[PDB]
Design a protein around this ligand. Structure first.
Ligand SMILES: Nc1ccn([C@H]2CC[C@@H](COP(=O)(O)OP(=O)(O)OP(=O)(O)O)O2)c(=O)n1
Ligand SMILES: [Mg+2]
Ligand SMILES: [Zn+2]
Length: 453
RNA sequence: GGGAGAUGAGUCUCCAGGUCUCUCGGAA
RNA sequence: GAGAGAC
């Protein structure tokens, strides 16, 4: 993904898009009884903690495109995945605008707490000004659709979140591409049944884990991914997607029976315009972070990538023997034969992809490890590392949130086991706020977990 | 380093995506 | 009406 040009709004006639430059995060009452190195991310160019130029660090992820049209491997990969997908019998018909605004059984309503994006956010107009779940009204949506059209620019923001001190100094804060309400409804209408189909079938048919619940899914992954585990990580996945991969995604959607009108919307994601502060810019390639179905589309393309890298690197690969589950850029996979992931990364480089540093005892996925239950080793605990639970607990947007914050942390933390869950809890109970909280009890958590099966 | 508010240099406050999972509080 | 985490 690569910026083509940059132009000030004065010249592009664009409304200016500026959000906070101060974090809502501040140390909690637990900030000092727990260790951690994460601080809120740089929002402002003059952050005293910066050691790099802020904006050039922000946009250094747009590292360019290498390839614009599929080769034979990407084509075959895309046909393999597409053929695998046919058995889901995805409905290619357009979803109703009411369904796509207010949600179905397997696709949540458009989220009305967040911005309505360009131009709406800049006009002062909000999602709930236009959408109403009491009435289920689509009329006001039709109107603003007409008035403002589609393929509107994305609103670039900077994500206000905890990050590691190193990313703070490198200025590598996270850029958000806010979606216009119009493009969200339209993309959802085109692909909503596709979303519901994926959300409904986390696993190795979809090749995706969107919609998984780690508590039970984690026991399935060894059964789902037999053979030799290989995994790796991407650096800047979304931004390093060359157009070649959007061409491949369109072949999948065509193969699964989509009209050419629905397939056309993908080029609107390949090619995006963003307003950041008071300038606008073209981006060619790259998955815009906040479009509709990014995690579905990011996971679909990951299925294409892995397939394409295998058959281009190694002779004698049977793609039918590949097993893989993806969550956007995250990936766990297996194949009957062990895979040389360095050889893999060297051809990934030829496609403009950067992969970096495997059994069940070391694997991670959605940031959790795999820990067999000692009394029932076929049941797998997803293990959020305590070091990260510690990073979260040390900060707050709001002290009234403490009891709900700590309690979510406990539902992640206990999978690490009794001895570690009790260290965590007794550290919390060493300050008087912590002793006032209702803390879920370990045997209750384990008991309710086992009953899930 | 934009805009609005409160306040009278400054101080605080508001803006900030797509989805999934879990969970707290209201409802019939 | 909210939160927390994950991509
Ligand atoms: N608020 C967020 C955070 C992440 N993601 C998705 C987009 C890509 C991936 C980024 O994961 P990171 O937390 O940045 O971990 P990483 O892959 O190791 O680091 P990076 O993507 O910055 O290189 O998650 C997202 O859509 N929204
Ligand atoms: Mg990973
Ligand atoms: Zn353009």
């Amino acid at each position: 993904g690569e910026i083509q040009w940059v132009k000030p709004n004065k010249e592009t006639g664009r409304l200016n898009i500026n959000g906070p430059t101060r974090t809502k995060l501040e140390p909690s009452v637990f900030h000092d009884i727990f260790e951690g190195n994460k601080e809120p991310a740089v929002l402002h160019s003059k952050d005293p903690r910066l050691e790099v130029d802020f904006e050039q660090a922000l946009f250094s992820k747009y590292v360019g495109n290498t390839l614009h049209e599929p080769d034979e491997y990407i084509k075959e990969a895309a046909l393999h995945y597409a053929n695998q997908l046919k058995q889901l019998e995805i409905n290619t018909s357009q979803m109703s605008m009411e369904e796509a605004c207010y949600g179905t059984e397997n696709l949540e309503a458009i989220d009305l707490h967040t911005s309505a994006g360009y131009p709406y956010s800049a006009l002062g107009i909000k999602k709930r000004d236009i959408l109403d779940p009491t009435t289920r009204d689509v009329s006001k949506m039709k109107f603003y659709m007409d008035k403002y059209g589609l393929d509107l620019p994305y609103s670039t923001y900077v994500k206000d979140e905890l990050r590691s001190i190193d990313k703070i100094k490198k200025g590598k804060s996270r850029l958000i591409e806010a979606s216009s309400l119009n493009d969200s409804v339209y993309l959802r209408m085109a692909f909503g049944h596709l979303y519901e189909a994926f959300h409904a079938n986390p696993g190795t048919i979809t090749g995706s884990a969107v919609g998984c619940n780690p508590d039970t899914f984690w026991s399935k992954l060894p059964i789902l991914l037999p053979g030799s585990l290989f995994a790796f990580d991407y650096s800047g996945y979304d931004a390093s997607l060359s157009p070649v991969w959007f061409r491949a995604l369109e072949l999948v959607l065509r193969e699964i029976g989509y009209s050419e009108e629905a397939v056309s919307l993908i080029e609107g994601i390949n090619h995006t315009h963003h307003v950041y502060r008071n300038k606008t810019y073209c981006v060619l390639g790259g998955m815009p972070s906040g479009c509709s179905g990014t995690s579905i589309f990011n996971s679909m393309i990951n299925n294409i990538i892995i397939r394409a890298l295998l058959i281009k690197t190694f002779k004698g690969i049977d793609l039918d023997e590949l097993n893989m589950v993806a969550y956007g850029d995250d990936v766990l996979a297996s194949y009957p034969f062990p895979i040389d992931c360095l050889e893999l990364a060297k051809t990934g480089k030829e496609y403009g992809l950067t992969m970096t540093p495997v059994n069940w005892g070391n694997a991670t996925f959605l940031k959790r490890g795999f820990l067999p239950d000692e009394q029932f080793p076929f049941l797998i605990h997803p293990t959020m590392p305590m070091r990260e639970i510690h990073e979260s607990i040390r900060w707050t947007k709001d002290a009234r949130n403490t009891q709900d914050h700590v309690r979510s942390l406990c539902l992640l933390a206990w999978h690490n086991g009794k001895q570690e869950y009790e260290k965590f809890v007794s550290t919390i109970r060493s300050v008087p706020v912590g002793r006032a909280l209702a803390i879920p009890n370990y045997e209750n958590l384990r008991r309710n977990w086992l009953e899930l099966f």
